[PDB]
């Protein structure tokens, strides 16, 4: 059978503000949960 | 202090993996 290009594929984006927000969220979640991970 | 021996790996991955997810998505944006 033939391999046909899929027309449903789309680009994903994460703008710079979204990057800063996500990095801050990850950093603060790490800050929060690290003490409990160490126990 | 006798802390959980998995604490360092857990915390580092907990931060690192979403960090690289965001980094990948941001850097490729506009491709």
């Amino acid at each position: 059978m033939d391999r046909n290009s899929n027309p449903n594929r789309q680009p994903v984006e994460l703008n710079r503000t979204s990057l800063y927000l996500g990095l801050l969220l990850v950093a603060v979640l790490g800050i929060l949960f690290s003490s409990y991970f160490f126990n | 202090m006798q802390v959980n021996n998995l604490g360092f790996i857990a915390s580092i991955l907990f931060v690192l993996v979403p960090t690289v997810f965001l980094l990948i998505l941001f850097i490729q944006t506009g491709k």
Binding site: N15, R16, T17, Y20, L23, L24, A27, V28, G30, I31, S34, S35, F38 | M1, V3, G7, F8, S11, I12, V15
Partner: peptide, 30 residues
Amino acid sequence: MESVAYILVLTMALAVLFFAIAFREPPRIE
């Protein structure tokens, strides 16, 4: 050595703050 982990995460948050301020996406009127 869990002090290192605590310092690491705190420094990550602070660096994110400095970059989000200094190197923010400029608001532009268009």
